[model samples]
Target: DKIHHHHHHMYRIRVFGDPVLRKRAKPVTKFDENLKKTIERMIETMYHYDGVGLAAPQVGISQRFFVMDVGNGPVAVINPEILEIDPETEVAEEGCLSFPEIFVEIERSKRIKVKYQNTRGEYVEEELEGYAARVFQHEFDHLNGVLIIDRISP
Candidate 1:
């Protein structure tokens, strides 16, 4: 089915001090046209900022979803759940669209298995490693009101 053309919605990326970024996002229960539009806008915003990943909270939407592109094409992750994570960790330089110019080295699981819903509400589970895993974890934290700043190495 073809999607009819409509006016584009642009979302503004919330900054580090924004209260929404500190609040845990609510789960997305509806997989309707509006939700699809929201995901499109989020993906657009992520590319606009040249960010590898962006969570709903970063766009001032308190919902359990995020958009990311780690060298691969863009992907929409909704109502995500981290199923498993490898005990082996890797410290990598990480940055966030919400954090602007700030970048920090944070330790993250090198590999992880996650379950999430697609834009069509279909459930999918997959494993991720390397940069992909890092990006996923970064965005996953946003859904839980966590930020890279809080994960900085002590």
Candidate 2:
């Protein structure tokens, strides 16, 4: 593993009461240096938070963006979508920085297929099953103005 470029990502945290957390971030239409720069800043912020991943608007930029660290590696999944998934699911306790300290049990699929673009703007597809799959889909929801709370079974 190599250390990626270090960028200053000191940023503001969103509170759960903010409407922005529920708003769908616009898809990034253009891929340029700025997109990459913002991605870098987000990655830095995720690292600072000791989080496995982060989304762009969570840092105050309202755009489809998210970063994740799956132990295998670090990934920045922007405008990502879950292409496929299993009907059966699992409930995992998850938390968001915006929510501050509330970890709730959220139900999500155990597997999924996803499509997204990389930092180079190349479209990519992937299939992840089990816990890893859950993480990706959950994070992607943050970009889509959705959340596990919406899917909770009461």
Candidate 3:
């Protein structure tokens, strides 16, 4: 099924200072229409807020999942794990929908390997670089109770 932009299940972006943003998210244990709808709404919410990626907690759902689009297309990463990251690093300015009006330069791996479940509940393992890798790392942080503001240089 094609992703629809007009779905009525869209959610609001949970902004900074929200307690849910600081809490660790739980892994997704069920894969069904509800999960699909959540992913769809997440995609719609990310695009609506003009964010490159969105974590479940960002929308007040304490779940281990995120949606991203580094211009390639929308993808949902569920229960993702960072398998590896290149030694090379890059300091790029990044922003979050949760932290509006704030962007900071954060050091991140230039490349990385990730294992995650897709929207279809299929296991997926892939290597990503540049912006895509950055997006994953950023969203992955959310599942672990991390945020961009915490990564800002003093």
Enumerate residue pairs that collide in model 3: none
> Each candidate's lDDT (Cα)?
0.93, 0.78, 0.91
* Minimal lDDT window, size 10, model 3: 1-10
Ranking by lDDT: 1, 3, 2
54 in model 2: Cα distance from truth in Å? 1.0
What would the per-residue lDDT of candidate 1 be over residues 82-110, giving only the tens digit for each residue? 99999999898988888778999999999
Q: Please give the clash total of every predicted structure, in order.
A: 0, 0, 0
Pairwise TM-score winner, candidates 2 and 3: 3
Q: Estimate TM-scores for all models.
A: 0.93, 0.87, 0.92
lDDT of 2 by residue, 1-154 (tens): 6777554456666666677878889888879998888787777777788877677767777788788887876788877877888898888788777776777788888888899998778899988976678778777887877765676654
Q: Can you write out model 3's per-residue Cα lDDT over 60-127, one digit (the tens) per residue? A: 99999999999989989999999999999898999988887899989899999999998678999999
What is the lDDT, from 0 to 100, of the residue 81 in candidate 2? Answer: 75
Off by over 4 Å in 2: 1-8
TM-score sort, best first? 1, 3, 2
